[PDB]
Symmetry: C4
Subunit: 76 residues, 4 copies
């Protein structure tokens, strides 16, 4: 009702389209990330690892190489 509130609502409406795109996409990405973890779970239950070696214990050379490539990509 107040003129200040009307301005605040107008500011939000100017941002709404952009925020909607970000928010909706973040929802789809979050859902897909959860599906990815469920697929990892089913895959590893069916194909178990004798030991689970995480990066703080030892980083696979494949992971190191992939990280270095993407780092160079981002640096360009």
């Amino acid at each position: 009702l107040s003129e200040q509130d009307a301005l605040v609502e107008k500011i939000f409406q100017r941002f709404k389209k952009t925020l909607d795109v970000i928010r909706v996409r973040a929802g789809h990405t979050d859902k897909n990330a959860q599906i990815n973890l469920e697929l990892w779970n089913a895959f590893l239950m069916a194909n178990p690892l004798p030991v689970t070696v995480l990066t703080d214990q030892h980083t696979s050379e494949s992971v190191s190489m992939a990280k270095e490539k993407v780092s160079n990509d981002i640096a360009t």
Copy 2:
């Protein structure tokens, strides 16, 4: 008048919102690619049974979750 102020506010935010929007957009695209690759991989290498985390969480998944939780707490 009022609209010119509102447009000025949005333009001040645009570059930051663009960076966020572009990064989230490519992440969403890559997440969709990731699922298609899972599909092709599992079609070629099927699982006799599909065990989801509500039935049983793999010890490997639990260890990875615990490690990442410690990383996020200390990073």
Copy 3:
């Protein structure tokens, strides 16, 4: 310049929230790129005789994971 001082104040109020979102989006984008590189190396070393995508046929494992996560999102 009176409007610009207010516009700058509004941005500074949001900066901390926007920085957190932007920095995480950057780390997530980098990790998603690494994930694709690891798929590439994994599939080059372990090629698929045929590549069946979900529009041709959706693996029952993918269908089950999608349904589980969809129920998770609906209940939460």
Copy 4:
């Protein structure tokens, strides 16, 4: 002025919270994904690691093309 600035932020807070929470869980899950790749590849090592700049797997190319069509139509 400051009361107006806070009103603007509070109007956006709920939308920004949803975005922040979703992005945070996605970032966490992406980290878990990389740790699982590490454990999987330590247990099942690759004789050579071929990245996309050397050669892109036909499976990756096909998946990329399908997803591009999906994003264009959805």
